[PDB]
Amino acid sequence: NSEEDKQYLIFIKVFQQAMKGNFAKIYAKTEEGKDPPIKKKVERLRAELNYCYDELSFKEYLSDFLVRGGLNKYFNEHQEEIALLIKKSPWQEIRIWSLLAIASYKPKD
Amino acid sequence: NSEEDKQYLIFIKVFQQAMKGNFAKIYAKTEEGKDPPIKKKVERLRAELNYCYDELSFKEYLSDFLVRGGLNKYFNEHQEEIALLIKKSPWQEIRIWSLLAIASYKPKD
Amino acid sequence: NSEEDKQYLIFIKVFQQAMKGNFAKIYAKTEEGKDPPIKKKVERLRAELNYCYDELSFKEYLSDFLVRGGLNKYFNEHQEEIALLIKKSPWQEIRIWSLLAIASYKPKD
Amino acid sequence: PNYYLYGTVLTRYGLASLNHDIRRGNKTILQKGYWNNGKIHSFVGSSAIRWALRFYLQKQGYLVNRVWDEEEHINRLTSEDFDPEKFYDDDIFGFALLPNQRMGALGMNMAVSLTPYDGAVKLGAKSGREKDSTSLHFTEYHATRYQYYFGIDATHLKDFSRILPMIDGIMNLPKVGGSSNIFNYPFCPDSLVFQWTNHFASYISYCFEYCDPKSKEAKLSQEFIDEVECGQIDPSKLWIGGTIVKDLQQLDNFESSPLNKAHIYRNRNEMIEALKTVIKRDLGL
Amino acid sequence: PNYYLYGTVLTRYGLASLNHDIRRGNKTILQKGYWNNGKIHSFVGSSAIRWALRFYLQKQGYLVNRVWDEEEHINRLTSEDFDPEKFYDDDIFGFALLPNQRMGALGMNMAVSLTPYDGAVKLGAKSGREKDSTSLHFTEYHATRYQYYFGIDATHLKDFSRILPMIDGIMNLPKVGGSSNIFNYPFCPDSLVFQWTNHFASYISYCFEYCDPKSKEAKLSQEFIDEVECGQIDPSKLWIGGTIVKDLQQLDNFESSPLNKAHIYRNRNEMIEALKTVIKRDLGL
DNA sequence: AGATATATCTACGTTTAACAGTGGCCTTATTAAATGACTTCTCCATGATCTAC
């Protein structure tokens, strides 16, 4: 695979780890009740991502989600590559990549 | 390639080193067996970064945070480039870069 | 290029040289094996910069800081440009530039 | 002698949600596509302006085959046998059965947004409580001026006097199909560039171009004027009117430029009256 | 001698849907194919421009064997036997009824789109709540400058004076077959590269290239300028006019390049007049 | 006049804490083409027979 495909794969894994962190925070914060909302959280995440209309707002939401996730091993191993990929590539393609990562989220067994 | 991207990457590194300095400061401040607040400090940093109302706001905060970081070599190497990048550029993109840096300091530790 | 950014950079250099003079003064003041207070001096400088209430406040402060710095060669060659830049521009912008210079002096030594 | 009327008029500044494309999700996608400089520009369908002119003709006498109900939201045909000799609608816009099929006297181009469209989205909610799938929705808008290009073959009209009502309607265009309830955008024009010549050669395409990202200055162009300076598009055949006149009169060397000796009227009504007089004189009405 | 006229023509910028191919489902695909760099471009067929030239010759008052009844939308033959001596269209475009056939002086190629086709589409729907199978539809459109190549043989014309009306028609081309109701795209030239030589070899075929993949810039191709530099394609036999003249004059070292000593005119009418004078002098007209 | 050691006072403390949205919805209808065309001519192979040398 070419370099761009590797960068895209690391971005997918980075987003998945960020969602791992956010879902862990949701589980910890709302342990009360029968079950915390995750399916509703996933639907809200999709709605927020589709809400973004230009590069500025979408990049703001993406960065905010990334920081909210926590430590990001995939984003640890690759700083400059993923940072340049985020800054350079058009925000729409980033939206496709984020949605694909959302749909590809492997639950922790 | 695309020296603007080089400046953006070195700014990410500068912000990471500044947060490293502030982490060292808070680790020095804490005493006894109390857990040093790092997750709390990171969340506080993210919340204050999101809170901003243009130009003076969040740029004063960026400069103050960089000063709080203390000795930072990456900013030492390149004075004029980073100084012009901070004075110029829309503040929202600088916020995006700083947030990224929040998510990309964790590679260091 | 972009002459106002030239004024901004020479202001950065003037502030760095003035704080170099102040650091030399305080190093001269101390004696014997006690660690000369410099990180504490940097913190004091930042705190005094942050403390200000527009116009006269922080302008008397910047003038006094430049005076206590000693003889500034860059200020000597650039009297008119520095004075005109200081008299004009919002004082918050000058404080931001000064904080950037606070973080910009380390490559000097 | 053959005669044609080519023109490109500019709309006023305001919000626009006139031509929702597909409503992908909750977002009623304001239809858009690439334009000058590769920036995405929102579009207003030319069929929308044709429908607006049809409605204008129907509203004021002017027998038309297709009557818009305005109550049942349906279109009624007075006579299925289209007769361009009698109806204004069949004579002007043409028809197709699937007979004569006409050709249409009026040729329209899709309206383009003079400014690129960034995201311009808007929320929508339905009161409070008891919320269903229809409660939350989004609508795209656009705060620009729209520009479109049209052309009529005067000779091709069955009744030569029918050119006057279309000019009156373009000057007084009714609501163009769109979200009038939420985004009431008047499509009346504020700057006109009309040419009335006897050969098909049709410059003055989308000349109005200002870019200047998010603004409302709406400068004329550089290429159109270039053309005017060079020698073609003779000023005697040009008609310019509207707010663009104010900008034009402030250009340097305007007194010596060939653009000066063109028909320039700051008021739109005066220029339209003069053009109507010229057309009536030329066509023998 | 043996004189021939070759040219590559570029059109203005606008929305065009002139060459719908066989439609699929509900969308009316406009014909497209591959071109430079492997990107899909939209093509307008040469038969359309030949029909437009025929219509121009019919309208201007020349004989024209094939009469096109606009109201009937039918084509009629003035005489069943083709007579290239008497009829302009039979002289120029040729015929084959199946003498019997003529080679035809005018040889034209397809009209390619200077800018690659992204895939922009437009939705159209019949108004009213009463909706049927023919309610909504999609029409494909393209915002591009179109470029086509043509070549004529002056000697092959039965009457040599017939070259003048064909040039006038090319510069004043009537509507090219398309959808003028919703995409009225003027095909009038705005930049020419004409060659009038006794040798046949032609190096001006598709000499136009885009500066940016989505833009209305229309700069001259590097190959054409380089070939003029190298020594072939004599500048004395070159004829360039239109909007590209400005870009050529803004090039560096233009006063030293061989492009300087070639016939270049900002106004297209002046260049056409000069070329027509040269042709009339060369062919004894 | 050249070479050399010395003297230059503040300063410090520069926020400690707790939170970084709690809820509900994430389009409801309808239409998913309507017509007609689906090459146009010629260029045949072979043997019997006519006819000129």
E 122-161 residues, CB < 7 A, strand F: 124-125, 131-137, 139
Token pair of E279 as six digits: 């042709």
Q: Do A88 and B5 touch (CB under 8 A)?
A: yes
Q: Do A51 and D138 touch (CB under 8 A)?
A: yes
Residue with tokens 């964790």: B106
Q: Do B75 and C99 touch (CB under 8 A)?
A: no
Identity at E121, one-letter amino acid code:
V
A interface mutation test: which of D23, D42, D138 has the most A CBs within 10 A? D138
Token pair of D42 as six digits: 């929102």
Q: Identify whether the C-beta of residue E179 lies closer than 8 Å to the C-beta of residue D104.
A: no
Q: Taking the mean position of all CA atoms in its chain, how far away is CA A69?
A: 8
Q: Which of D170, D118, D243, D128 is nearest to D5 (CA)?
A: D170
Q: Output the distance from B16 CA to F18 C1' rounded to whole Å.
A: 27
- Name the packing angle between helices E163-171 and E46-60 (round to 10°): 110
Q: A85 vs chain D: nearest CA distance in angstroms?
A: 22
What are the C-alpha distances in Å from A54 to residues A59, A60, D28, D191? 9, 10, 16, 31
SS3 category, B88: coil
Token pair of D127 as six digits: 């009161």
- Is chain A in touch with chain B: ≥3 Cβ pairs within 8 A? yes
Q: D29: nearest CA in chain E? A: E123
SS3 category, E30: strand
Helix, strand counts (H, E) of chain C: 6, 0
Residue with tokens 């530039």: C97
Sorted by sequence, the CB contacts under 8 Å of residue A56 that are 6+ apart come out as B92, B93
In this structure, is the CB of residue B64 within 7 Å of any atom belonging to strand F?
no
* Cβ count near D247 (within 10 Å): 15
Name the pairing type of β-strands D40-44 and D75-77: unpaired
What are the C-alpha distances in Å from D139 to residues A92, D3, D13, D31, D130? 19, 43, 19, 12, 22
End-to-end CA distance of chain C: 28
Distance in angstroms (rounded) separating the CA atoms of residues C72 and C82: 12
**E236 DSSP 8-state letter:** G
What are the E-state strand segments in E162-224? 189-197, 208-209, 219-220
Whether the CB of A90 is below 8 Å from some CB of chain D: the reply is: no
Distance in angstroms (rounded) separating the CA atoms of residues C19 and C42: 10
Looking across all nucleic acid strands, the nucleotide with the smallest C1' to CA distance from residue E138 is F33
- Is chain B in touch with chain E: ≥3 Cβ pairs within 8 A? no
Q: Which of E103, E82, E81 is nearest to E92 (CA)?
A: E103
Q: Output the distance from E98 CA to F44 C1' rounded to whole Å.
A: 19
Identity at C24, one-letter amino acid code:
A
**Measured between CB atoms, which of B5, B42, B103 is closest to A84?**
B5
Q: Identify whether the C-beta of residue D156 lies closer than 8 Å to the C-beta of residue D105.
A: yes
Distance in angstroms (rounded) separating the CA atoms of residues C96 and B64: 8
Q: Output the distance from E81 CA to F51 C1' rounded to whole Å.
A: 40
Residue with tokens 């129907």: D58
Distance in angstroms (rounded) separating the CA atoms of residues D70 and C50: 67
Burial of B8 (0-12, 13-18, 19+ CB in 10 A): buried
- Closest amino acid to nucleotide F18 (CA–C1'): B40
Put residue A96 in one of left, alpha, beta given phi > 0 → left and psi -120 to 50 → alpha. Answer: alpha
Angle at A60 between CA A59 and CA A66, to 5 degrees: 85
In this structure, is the CB of residue A64 within 7 Å of any atom belonging to strand F?
no
Q: A53: nearest CA in chain D? A: D119
What are the E-state strand segments in chain D? 4-11, 14-15, 27-28, 32-34, 40-44, 66-68, 75-77, 106-108, 111-113, 121-124, 137-140, 143-144, 146-153, 189-197, 238-242, 263-265
CB pairs under 8 A between A and D: 12
**Side-chain half-sphere exposure of D156, counting CA atoms within 13 A:** 22
Sorted by sequence, the CB contacts under 8 Å of residue C64 that are 6+ apart come out as none
- In chain B, what are the helix, strand and coil shares in percent, each to the nearest 5? 75, 0, 25
Identity at D155, one-letter amino acid code:
T
D 148-207 residues, CB < 7 A, strand F: none
Phi/psi for D92 (5° steps) reads -90, -60
Q: E245 vs chain D: nearest CA distance in angstroms?
A: 11
Distance in angstroms (rounded) separating the CA atoms of residues E13 and E185: 9
Q: Do C99 and B67 touch (CB under 8 A)?
A: yes
Name the pairing type of β-strands E40-44 and E32-34: antiparallel
Q: Which residues of B touch A83 (CB under 8 A)?
A: 8-9, 12, 100, 104
Distance in angstroms (rounded) separating the CA atoms of residues D152 and D160: 12
Q: Output the distance from A31 CA to F25 C1' rounded to whole Å.
A: 24
Phi/psi for E74 (5° steps) reads -130, 160
What are the C-alpha distances in Å from E115 to residues D109, D148, E45, E211? 19, 21, 17, 10
Q: D49: nearest CA in chain E? A: E182
Resolution rounded to one decimal, in angstroms: 3.1
Name the pairing type of β-strands D75-77 and D66-68: antiparallel
Distance in angstroms (rounded) separating the CA atoms of residues E76 and A84: 66
Distance in angstroms (rounded) separating the CA atoms of residues A92 and E47: 41
Q: E284 vs chain D: nearest CA distance in angstroms?
A: 28
- Which residue(s) pair with B41 in the sheet? none
**Measured between CB atoms, which of C42, C92, C100 is closest to B83?**
C100
Computed from CA positions of residues D192, D246, D258, E246, in that sequence, does the dihedral angle turn out positive or negative?
Answer: negative
Q: Taking the mean position of all CA atoms in its chain, how far away is CA E114?
A: 13
In this structure, is the CB of residue B40 within 7 Å of any atom belonging to strand F?
yes
Burial of D88 (0-12, 13-18, 19+ CB in 10 A): buried
Distance in angstroms (rounded) separating the CA atoms of residues D205 and D105: 18
